[PDB]
Design a protein around this motif. Structure first.
Motif, mmCIF file in Angstrom:
data_model
loop_
_atom_site.group_PDB
_atom_site.id
_atom_site.type_symbol
_atom_site.label_atom_id
_atom_site.label_comp_id
_atom_site.label_asym_id
_atom_site.label_seq_id
_atom_site.Cartn_x
_atom_site.Cartn_y
_atom_site.Cartn_z
ATOM 1 N N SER A 90 4.900 4.778 -12.793
ATOM 2 C CA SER A 90 4.735 4.539 -11.365
ATOM 3 C C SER A 90 5.028 5.802 -10.571
ATOM 4 O O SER A 90 4.373 6.075 -9.557
ATOM 5 C CB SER A 90 5.639 3.390 -10.920
ATOM 6 O OG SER A 90 6.997 3.674 -11.208
ATOM 7 N N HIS A 91 5.994 6.580 -11.035
ATOM 8 C CA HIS A 91 6.336 7.816 -10.353
ATOM 9 C C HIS A 91 5.207 8.828 -10.412
ATOM 10 O O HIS A 91 4.815 9.384 -9.387
ATOM 11 C CB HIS A 91 7.595 8.423 -10.969
ATOM 12 C CG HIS A 91 7.709 9.901 -10.769
ATOM 13 N ND1 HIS A 91 7.260 10.814 -11.700
ATOM 14 C CD2 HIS A 91 8.210 10.627 -9.742
ATOM 15 C CE1 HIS A 91 7.484 12.038 -11.257
ATOM 16 N NE2 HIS A 91 8.061 11.952 -10.071
ATOM 17 N N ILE A 92 4.676 9.073 -11.606
ATOM 18 C CA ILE A 92 3.653 10.113 -11.752
ATOM 19 C C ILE A 92 2.300 9.797 -11.098
ATOM 20 O O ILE A 92 1.737 10.655 -10.421
ATOM 21 C CB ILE A 92 3.437 10.467 -13.237
ATOM 22 C CG1 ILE A 92 4.789 10.668 -13.922
ATOM 23 C CG2 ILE A 92 2.572 11.711 -13.362
ATOM 24 C CD1 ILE A 92 4.818 11.810 -14.913
ATOM 25 N N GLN A 93 1.775 8.588 -11.288
ATOM 26 C CA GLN A 93 0.524 8.240 -10.628
ATOM 27 C C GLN A 93 0.648 8.633 -9.178
ATOM 28 O O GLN A 93 -0.156 9.411 -8.666
ATOM 29 C CB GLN A 93 0.222 6.746 -10.701
ATOM 30 C CG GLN A 93 0.899 5.980 -11.819
ATOM 31 C CD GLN A 93 1.398 4.629 -11.343
ATOM 32 O OE1 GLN A 93 1.736 4.464 -10.171
ATOM 33 N NE2 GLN A 93 1.450 3.659 -12.244
ATOM 34 N N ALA A 94 1.657 8.091 -8.509
ATOM 35 C CA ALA A 94 1.886 8.407 -7.105
ATOM 36 C C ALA A 94 1.987 9.914 -6.900
ATOM 37 O O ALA A 94 1.969 10.402 -5.772
ATOM 38 C CB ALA A 94 3.146 7.717 -6.606
ATOM 39 N N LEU B 134 0.662 -6.785 -9.414
ATOM 40 C CA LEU B 134 -0.220 -7.387 -8.420
ATOM 41 C C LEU B 134 -0.213 -6.589 -7.123
ATOM 42 O O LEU B 134 -1.252 -6.453 -6.466
ATOM 43 C CB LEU B 134 0.193 -8.836 -8.165
ATOM 44 C CG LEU B 134 -0.104 -9.825 -9.295
ATOM 45 C CD1 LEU B 134 0.815 -11.034 -9.211
ATOM 46 C CD2 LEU B 134 -1.563 -10.254 -9.267
ATOM 47 N N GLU B 135 0.950 -6.068 -6.727
ATOM 48 C CA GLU B 135 1.013 -5.220 -5.543
ATOM 49 C C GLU B 135 0.185 -3.957 -5.735
ATOM 50 O O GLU B 135 -0.535 -3.531 -4.824
ATOM 51 C CB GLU B 135 2.466 -4.866 -5.226
ATOM 52 C CG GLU B 135 3.232 -5.963 -4.503
ATOM 53 C CD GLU B 135 4.654 -5.556 -4.172
ATOM 54 O OE1 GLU B 135 5.260 -4.806 -4.964
ATOM 55 O OE2 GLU B 135 5.166 -5.987 -3.117
ATOM 56 N N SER B 136 0.274 -3.342 -6.916
ATOM 57 C CA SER B 136 -0.555 -2.177 -7.201
ATOM 58 C C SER B 136 -2.036 -2.534 -7.147
ATOM 59 O O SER B 136 -2.845 -1.780 -6.596
ATOM 60 C CB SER B 136 -0.193 -1.596 -8.567
ATOM 61 O OG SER B 136 -0.766 -2.359 -9.614
ATOM 62 N N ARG B 137 -2.406 -3.685 -7.712
ATOM 63 C CA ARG B 137 -3.801 -4.114 -7.673
ATOM 64 C C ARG B 137 -4.278 -4.304 -6.240
ATOM 65 O O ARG B 137 -5.373 -3.860 -5.875
ATOM 66 C CB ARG B 137 -3.972 -5.406 -8.469
ATOM 67 C CG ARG B 137 -3.902 -5.233 -9.978
ATOM 68 C CD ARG B 137 -3.432 -6.513 -10.649
ATOM 69 N NE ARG B 137 -3.699 -6.515 -12.082
ATOM 70 C CZ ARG B 137 -3.331 -7.483 -12.911
ATOM 71 N NH1 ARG B 137 -2.673 -8.548 -12.482
ATOM 72 N NH2 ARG B 137 -3.627 -7.379 -14.203
ATOM 73 N N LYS B 138 -3.468 -4.966 -5.409
ATOM 74 C CA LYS B 138 -3.848 -5.188 -4.019
ATOM 75 C C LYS B 138 -3.951 -3.874 -3.258
ATOM 76 O O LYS B 138 -4.909 -3.659 -2.506
ATOM 77 C CB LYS B 138 -2.839 -6.116 -3.340
ATOM 78 C CG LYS B 138 -2.772 -7.515 -3.930
ATOM 79 C CD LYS B 138 -1.397 -8.130 -3.719
ATOM 80 C CE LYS B 138 -1.163 -9.305 -4.653
ATOM 81 N NZ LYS B 138 0.252 -9.773 -4.611
ATOM 82 N N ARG B 139 -2.980 -2.987 -3.442
ATOM 83 C CA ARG B 139 -2.980 -1.700 -2.760
ATOM 84 C C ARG B 139 -4.196 -0.880 -3.172
ATOM 85 O O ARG B 139 -4.885 -1.224 -4.132
ATOM 86 C CB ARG B 139 -1.693 -0.929 -3.061
ATOM 87 C CG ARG B 139 -0.450 -1.515 -2.411
ATOM 88 C CD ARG B 139 0.806 -1.124 -3.172
ATOM 89 N NE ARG B 139 2.001 -1.745 -2.615
ATOM 90 C CZ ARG B 139 3.223 -1.596 -3.108
ATOM 91 N NH1 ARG B 139 3.452 -0.847 -4.173
ATOM 92 N NH2 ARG B 139 4.242 -2.211 -2.513
#
Lengths: 146, 158, 153
Positions: free
Chosen positions: A142-146, C148-153
């Motif tokens: 999650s850190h790297i994608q962002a 799901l939050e990542s999918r929505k975003r």
């Protein structure tokens, strides 16, 4: 001027025993040489007659408590003679301050608690640990994608 | 006159070799008068088979009030495993002043099987050093692929 | 030549689903050894004690009581929950036999018994078991919520 040599026993293995048993053995010697005198013991408000052994001056007080109720700590056993015991009972009936009556002698019994078994469970605690390493992986992602 | 009901019970779920055995004696005076010179004797535990940890098997009480009970406990440690018969104890008391001595027996738990310490350990002992050794044994086949997988992460997925 | 006594130490009110334990004392005023065989307890119809309602497990004793000697016996039983709230006659029998082998039975207790129902409220410990399991699943719920939050975003 009572002289006492106290010895006590407390159950340590709750896996085997059904209840926690407290035993207090006291060898009592009096300056006036009084023998076979009736003793009464008070433990946390509970009064138990003091058992006398065959040997002269030997007394024992025993009581049992549930493992869940036998909390670790120091239990104070207060011993009273017949007159002091009668006064204590009269005060208890009148709801008077029991601490006013001084016991003949006090024996402190320290209980370290009973052993019951392992709280940790592989089914619940271990499953979380495996998830955490993988959740660390997700956090790193999650850190790297962002 | 005083009438005493004495019960001998074991406060242990099982008898285990080398572990403390708790004996509890309860005497109840159901008579209208108080029992005088109540003596409890339990000679059913020879020193060669049971070691006394706490308490005294022979006890005496000057007086037991009517409708009152006295509790006595003794902690013993068996020295030999096998089957043991917990026989009743002897209780002597005077039901009335200057009256005849009354002899009675407490409740008898009966024959009880004392579990040998080795058998008890095999049935209940906790395995921790084998648990560490097991875990170490599994560590290679599970981790070596795990470390190679991390080598995958860290050479060229960045 | 036999004297018996009974004393209820726990469960004197006979609570439903609770342990009832009483002491039976056998006293030998005879000149021979009495052999106590078993102690039996059973619930009878208050209007007719001949019809058995529930027979508790017999407690074989096989204890020899010498003459002029007293013996005490301990028995316990747990009344059934559905059976609470109804009067039940209680018959408690102590079985003893002569050295000759003649058998004499004495009813230590033969009186009607009142049984009181007990109701237990919801337990929070079961809910605690359930919620620790639900949190084991709730870690997954949180992960899927993040997905799901990542999918929505």
């Amino acid at each position: 001027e009572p002289q006492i040599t106290p010895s006590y026993y407390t159950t340590s293995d709750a896996v085997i025993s059904t209840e926690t048993v407290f035993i207090v053995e006291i060898s009592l010697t009096c300056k006036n040489r009084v023998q076979n005198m009736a003793l009464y013991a008070d433990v946390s408000g509970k009064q138990f007659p003091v058992t006398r052994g065959q040997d002269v001056g030997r007394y024992q007080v025993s009581w049992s408590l549930d493992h869940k109720s036998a909390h670790a700590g120091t239990y104070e056993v207060r011993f009273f003679d017949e007159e002091s015991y009668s006064l204590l009972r009269k005060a208890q009936r009148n709801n008077e301050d029991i601490s006013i009556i001084p016991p003949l002698f006090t024996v402190s019994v320290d209980h370290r608690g009973t052993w019951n078994g392992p709280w940790v469970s592989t089914e619940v605690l271990a499953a979380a640990i495996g998830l955490v390493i993988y959740y660390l992986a997700f956090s790193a992602k999650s850190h790297i994608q962002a | 006159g005083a009438r005493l009901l004495a019960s001998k019970s074991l406060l242990n779920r099982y008898a285990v070799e080398g572990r403390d055995l708790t004996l509890q004696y309860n005497i109840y005076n159901v008579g209208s008068s108080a029992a005088l010179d109540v003596e409890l004797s339990d000679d059913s535990f020879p020193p060669e088979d049971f070691g006394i940890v706490s308490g005294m098997l022979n006890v005496k009480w000057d007086r037991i009030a009517p409708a009152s009970n006295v509790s006595h406990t003794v902690v013993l440690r068996p020295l030999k495993a096998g089957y043991f018969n917990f026989t009743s104890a002897t209780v002597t008391y005077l039901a009335q002043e200057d009256g005849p001595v009354v002899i009675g027996f407490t409740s008898a738990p009966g024959q009880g099987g004392i579990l040998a310490q080795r058998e008890f350990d095999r049935r209940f002992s906790p395995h921790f050093l084998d648990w560490a050794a097991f875990g170490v044994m599994t560590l290679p086949s599970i981790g070596i692929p795990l470390l190679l997988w991390y080598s995958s992460k860290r050479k060229y997925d960045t | 030549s036999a004297d018996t006594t009974i004393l209820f130490v726990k469960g004197e009110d006979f609570p439903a689903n609770n342990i009832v334990k009483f002491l039976v004392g056998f006293t030998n005023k005879g000149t021979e050894d009495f052999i106590v065989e078993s102690l039996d307890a059973s619930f009878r119809y208050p209007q007719d004690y001949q019809f058995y309602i529930q027979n508790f497990t017999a407690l074989p004793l096989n204890t020899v009581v010498p003459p002029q000697r007293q013996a005490t016996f301990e028995y316990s039983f747990i009344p059934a929950e559905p059976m609470g709230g109804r009067p039940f006659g209680l018959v408690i029998n102590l079985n003893y036999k002569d050295l000759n082998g003649n058998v004499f039975q004495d009813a230590v207790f033969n009186q009607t018994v009142t049984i009181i129902e007990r109701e237990d409220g919801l337990d929070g410990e079961t809910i605690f078991m359930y919620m620790f399991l639900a949190g084991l699943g709730l870690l997954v719920v949180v992960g899927l919520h993040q997905l799901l939050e990542s999918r929505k975003r």
